[PDB]
Protein: Ubiquitin-conjugating enzyme E2 L6
Amino acid sequence: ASMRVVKELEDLQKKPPPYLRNLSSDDANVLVWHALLLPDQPPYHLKAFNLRISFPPEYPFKPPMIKFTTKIYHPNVDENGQICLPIISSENWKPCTKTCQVLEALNVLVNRPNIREPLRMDLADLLTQNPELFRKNAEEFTLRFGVDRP
Structure:
């Protein structure tokens, strides 16, 4: 479990995707990772967003758990950094799924909001109905809470 996680960790730190920075495991726990996500989608591209990836002791039979620690204003994340990400839901989780694929799909989600099945519906509606107003909302919130962009 820690054995699988460490090698996944090493492989990603060595060859990171461009949208993933400061990938490292917690000072103490090897089954918790932290990373900055760098969205490209305005206005989130102004800041970087830190996330906590937790591996359960059962991993890879059980799916890992991702949350944002940095606050983000987004249709698909709640105020506590929670997300619905199919690839790591229990319904869908497959032990042969790697963490890099999890991270890829999260990057996709952040970049391309799912308006059909959102976490924050008002936000989904806003984004469909007044994209420019959404953008102002997300921007102020990004600038206010975002980690500086590398």
Remarks:
- The chain has one domain: 1-150.
